[PDB]
Design a protein around this ligand. Structure first.
Ligand SMILES: O=C(/C=C/C=C/c1ccc2c(c1)OCO2)NCCCCCC[PH](c1ccccc1)(c1ccccc1)c1ccccc1
Ligand SMILES: *[C@@H]1O[C@H](CO[C@@H]2O[C@@H](C)[C@@H](O)[C@@H](O)[C@@H]2O)[C@@H](O[C@@H]2O[C@H](CO)[C@@H](O)[C@H](O)[C@H]2NC(C)=O)[C@H](O)[C@H]1NC(C)=O
Ligand SMILES: *[C@@H]1O[C@H](CO[C@@H]2O[C@@H](C)[C@@H](O)[C@@H](O)[C@@H]2O)[C@@H](O[C@@H]2O[C@H](CO)[C@@H](O)[C@H](O)[C@H]2NC(C)=O)[C@H](O)[C@H]1NC(C)=O
Ligand SMILES: *[C@@H]1O[C@H](CO)[C@@H](O)[C@H](O[C@@H]2O[C@H](CO)[C@@H](O)[C@H](O)[C@H]2NC(C)=O)[C@H]1NC(C)=O
Ligand SMILES: *[C@@H]1O[C@H](CO)[C@@H](O)[C@H](O)[C@H]1NC(C)=O
Ligand SMILES: [Br-]
Ligand SMILES: [Br-]
Ligand SMILES: [Cl-]
Ligand SMILES: [Cl-]
Ligand SMILES: [Cl-]
Ligand SMILES: [Cl-]
Ligand SMILES: [Cl-]
Ligand SMILES: [Cl-]
Ligand SMILES: [Cl-]
Ligand SMILES: [Cl-]
Ligand SMILES: [Cl-]
Ligand SMILES: [Cl-]
Ligand SMILES: [Cl-]
Ligand SMILES: [Cl-]
Ligand SMILES: [Cl-]
Ligand SMILES: [Cl-]
Ligand SMILES: [Cl-]
Ligand SMILES: [Cl-]
Ligand SMILES: [Cl-]
Ligand SMILES: [Cl-]
Ligand SMILES: [Cl-]
Ligand SMILES: [Cl-]
Ligand SMILES: [Cl-]
Ligand SMILES: [Cl-]
Ligand SMILES: [Cl-]
Lengths: 533, 540
């Protein structure tokens, strides 16, 4: 029919009709938004895709940007769900739009999704990011895009013109510039676009909020289990150059301008293979090529930009899962596996602190064990397991997002905070991991509504409730419904009251304090300790 | 009216008094000279044994109180007047007292020795709440208490000097212990089973006695109530002791130095100044403005204390030792009204955060800025950082934990880990007669009333449940003195009081409710004070 042919500023498109229980929606998958960043364009800021003859086959997802794939638990759904589900390519700068089947007559608010995965992995084509349920249930249009990861997106020789850094973030900004120009052609309202992303995606949303040349491209922001001020999300210029030159040394690449020309000669698969070998210490929740504080894009460290900014006119929805740290322990913590119950020794715990909190002093590590061991049960392996799970999750996600939330609200933002604490009935991961990092996404996207997946019916109502909260936020800057006071109110997070809500099968329960007592240590005391020792 | 009231000790004849309790009478010998008066040239000098006397000594009334500051904070208030000296002040104060049961026991009976508290600057055995008669009547033990020099009179030191060597208040105590070694037999007491018990500075001194070998031959069991020798307030270094002493001499105008030595001339000038002028400038030698700090305390001099108590604790001779230790529930509250901004017994002391942050700087005086921030981290409720009610209770914890709770918790674990049999309690019943306000809970010093059986005095308006409580407590203590074990020799149903161990850390709760066995003596808080905080101070 004619609903599946739309033409944007660069050429004609041919979409696909997707089927949901609630009805059909129309999808345009794999839209080129940049000239392929190959050869001399590798490590370079993206260039806008020039117009094309003919019609683009936009019926299936395009390729995945080159990334390391996870072989810890081969064939296991818990890890394979996040692995690439299409061919790897450096020709990967494509985006996707979902829109309702009766194409909207009125301008509709748009959600744009930025996938996570520690700036080294991820793809928009993942099944857990399927847009159809969100646009069919709540009648918004949804855009997602691929951005370069690993060294291809975030290797930097700071100061150089040929490896400037943050081109994966510039990939994102370019796609946002694309929706301003082209989301109108699909029923989307350029004047109400909401960014939402999880993990490294959430941090990417944060950095767009701190980068003036992009803050004009969106109006609301959702940060799921991530913040740009996290200890893992940025590196200094000196460390970025230190990591880039050692990668070149590892692939036999003997100044800056010759260093980068050499790297463009290596096949992309050769760079990927040496990615994790450049890290300065053996560590958990650390990644080799992430955004760099260079003055371009990030005028200052994200913590500074957060501290002295004005956020009036901004609504932000942020939150964490209940067990942020558990997922990461099985990726390098001594004594941890998905297959046993991971009851660690005190010696394994004490060693786990040094790898969970890498590159801090001996005194700092003692401070961590002082705050996290139970001195009536210093040896109980279950308590040490839960303890190290907290250490990693708090230091890396909750305390970074709690710090961002307190300062945004205190400086003019309207902030709503959640803790997602429902364990999916479908969870392949063991039960000691609780609600792991990344396992709200399924519900936010309404995946329980897929008949092929056997989620319970109470779970399907949960996702419909959740995707309404999100849509509601995107439309209004408020998850609650305006003509519905009887429904339990989601109060704004504020620096003093620190109110958040709980997302599980029970109605909205309002709790106060986002692990306040622990994040006082990470956000307040610990920097003072490091600065004076 | 009998012959039980005429006893002869190694130095002469004594004349006692019959004392009255409801349950019966006891015979008491008060004001027994155990040392030659430390006057004139004897000021600041180690005590000398009382020379023997012709005739009979009148041992019928309490002797004098050692010269000390009197508390002028709340005149006429029972809460503060309770501890104030209730006899004439004099430097002639080295006298002791003995209580013994009527018909003095046929058998050798164990003896309890009491050492009073008051931060080494105050206190006397003459206080009403230290009246021995009730428990010596109730439990058939003999009880001894003694006066020791306090303030500069007991603990001024120029380390190395012959004329002010320090710890002479402790040497006063040691002299009294060897006195019972020679003479408690004359009263029915067994020199070979004597138990020391004391509160705060008393508790610290009994603790210090078991770390000084020449005192371990003088007792066999030890009770430490709300005090420990390793407390941050209980000892000073030689350098700080000389610094605090010389500054007192300058404050009362002692320049001269014509011949001899600088040290010996400095003290001779101090010997000439009246006692009350020294008392008046006592609190001015403190290095910073503080609560729970006292200027003249024992010094680590190499003699009495060969090393710091925390050192001496670690490598001690403690196997075969029974020790009973505990704290009240609100240790810090009493001390806040003596310098913490925003606090009064008459106010509800709802403090601001700005006042709290200033209060940690005075409760925890001797430390760096980074250390002080660490204290605010663990004790602030970051969900209600401004709530004045929580800030009030919070600062109470900082002072209570830092000064008594964590020091006795540290001493109890290390005694247990080296072979001692340690029993631990938490006293958490609030006397109905409480003079102090309600926010102070059970303050520092208000278990003493019950331990001594003051609820049984008809003059006082204690409740009926309180008098049975005191009888139970007086039994716990007596049992320990007799056996090294407070609970019943083989009670079938009364809940057993387990020994405190370094791993299980079991203690009991002392209130009208039966023995509650709890685990962990503020374990999570004292990890900061006993373990993390010293590393931080040594590393900044
Ligand atoms: O803690 C981490 C990071 C983990 C998370 C990834 C993730 C997953 C799903 C997500 C997501 C993020 O956000 C949204 O959803 N740690 C690194 C582990 C990542 C995978 C393999 C790397 P590691 C290695 C190298 C250097 C330092 C530390 C770790 C490895 C180590 C121990 C056990 C298993 C794997 C490796 C690299 C190259 C060859 C062999 C092994
Ligand atoms: C929990 O399991 C981990 C890993 O156990 C096994 O790893 C494979 C070798 C295989 O046997 C799987 O069935 C298990 O998952 C234990 O930690 C490992 O211990 C082995 C020694 O047996 C050592 O060689 C590895 O390096 C260890 N791995 C790590 C990451 O430390 C751990 O001890 C188990 N917990 C227990 C037993 O309480
Ligand atoms: C709580 O009380 C203290 C002092 O207790 C007394 O309370 C009053 C009835 C008044 O008569 C005071 O003079 C008493 O000492 C208060 O602390 C002092 O407050 C005054 C008033 O401005 C001030 O000048 C002093 O510096 C304060 N003392 C300090 C800071 O050490 C305190 O303010 C009272 N809190 C209240 C009433 O909320
Ligand atoms: C880096 O290394 C050498 C000199 O240190 C030099 O090759 C690079 O720039 C060169 O500039 C020359 C000017 O025309 C010319 O030889 C060529 O453009 C280029 N060389 C190349 C690409 O191999 C140096 N680059 C810097 C200093 O930025
Ligand atoms: C549940 O769904 C899985 C795939 O997600 C499928 O393999 C399985 O057969 C389903 N359950 C049943 C009982 O059929
Ligand atoms: Br244990
Ligand atoms: Br012994
Ligand atoms: Cl054409
Ligand atoms: Cl499996
Ligand atoms: Cl419409
Ligand atoms: Cl740009
Ligand atoms: Cl930062
Ligand atoms: Cl600031
Ligand atoms: Cl170090
Ligand atoms: Cl247990
Ligand atoms: Cl507002
Ligand atoms: Cl399981
Ligand atoms: Cl709550
Ligand atoms: Cl005489
Ligand atoms: Cl005679
Ligand atoms: Cl008898
Ligand atoms: Cl005292
Ligand atoms: Cl000296
Ligand atoms: Cl000094
Ligand atoms: Cl307590
Ligand atoms: Cl508050
Ligand atoms: Cl409240
Ligand atoms: Cl509470
Ligand atoms: Cl009152
Ligand atoms: Cl505690």
């Amino acid at each position: 029919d004619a609903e599946l042919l739309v033409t944007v500023r660069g050429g004609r498109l041919r979409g696909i009709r997707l089927k949901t229980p609630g009805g059909p929606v129309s999808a345009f998958l794999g839209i080129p938004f940049a000239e392929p960043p190959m050869g001399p364009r590798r490590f370079l800021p993206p260039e806008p895709k020039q117009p094309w003859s003919g019609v683009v086959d936009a019926t299936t997802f395009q390729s995945v940007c080159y990334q390391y794939v996870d072989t810890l638990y081969p064939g296991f759904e818990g890890t394979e769900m996040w692995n690439p589900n299409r061919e790897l390519s450096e020709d990967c700068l494509y985006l996707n739009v979902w829109t309702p089947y009766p194409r909207p007559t009125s301008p509709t608010p748009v959600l744009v999704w930025i996938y996570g995965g520690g700036f080294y992995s991820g793809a928009s084509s993942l099944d857990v990011y399927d847009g159809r349920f969100l646009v069919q249930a709540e009648r918004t249009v949804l855009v997602s895009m691929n951005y370069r990861v690993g060294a291809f997106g975030f290797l930097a020789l700071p100061g150089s013109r040929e490896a400037p850094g943050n081109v994966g973030l510039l990939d994102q900004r370019l796609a946002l510039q694309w929706v301003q120009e082209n989301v109108a052609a699909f029923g989307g309202d350029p004047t109400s676009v909401t960014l939402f992303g999880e993990s490294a995606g959430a941090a990417s949303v944060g950095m767009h909020l701190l980068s003036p040349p992009s803050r004009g491209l969106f109006h609301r922001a959702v940060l799921q289990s991530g913040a740009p001020n996290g200890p893992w999300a940025t590196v200094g210029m000196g460390e970025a150059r230190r990591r880039a030159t050692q990668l070149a040394h590892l692939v036999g690449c003997p100044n800056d301008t010759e260093l980068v020309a050499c790297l463009r000669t290596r096949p992309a698969q050769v760079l990927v293979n040496h990615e994790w070998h450049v890290l300065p210490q053996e560590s958990v929740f650390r990644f080799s090529f992430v955004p760099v504080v260079d003055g371009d894009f990030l005028s200052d460290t994200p913590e500074a930009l957060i501290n002295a900014g004005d956020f009036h006119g901004l609504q932000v929805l942020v939150g964490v899962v209940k067990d942020e740290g558990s997922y990461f322990l099985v990726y390098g913590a001594p004594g941890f596996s998905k297959d046993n119950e991971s009851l660690i020794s005190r010696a394994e715990f004490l060693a786990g602190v040094r790898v969970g909190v890498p590159q801090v002093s001996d005194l700092a590590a003692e401070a961590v064990v002082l705050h996290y061991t139970d001195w009536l049960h210093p040896e109980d392996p279950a308590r040490l397991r839960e303890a190290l799970s907290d250490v990693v999750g708090d230091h890396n996600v909750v305390c970074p997002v709690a710090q961002l939330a307190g300062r945004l609200a205190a400086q003019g933002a309207r902030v709503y905070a959640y803790v997602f604490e429902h364990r999916a009935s479908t969870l392949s991961w063991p039960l000691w991991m609780g609600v792991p990092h990344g396992y709200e996404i399924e519900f936010i996207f309404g995946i329980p509504l897929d008949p092929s997946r056997n989620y319970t019916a109470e779970e399907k109502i949960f996702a419909q409730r959740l995707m309404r909260y999100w849509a509601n936020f995107a439309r209004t800057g408020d998850p609650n419904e305006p003509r519905d006071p009887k429904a339990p109110q989601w109060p704004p997070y504020t620096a003093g009251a620190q109110q958040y809500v709980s997302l599980d099968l029970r109605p909205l329960e309002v709790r106060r304090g986002l692990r306040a007592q622990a994040c006082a240590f990470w956000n307040r005391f610990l920097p003072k300790l490091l600065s004076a020792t």
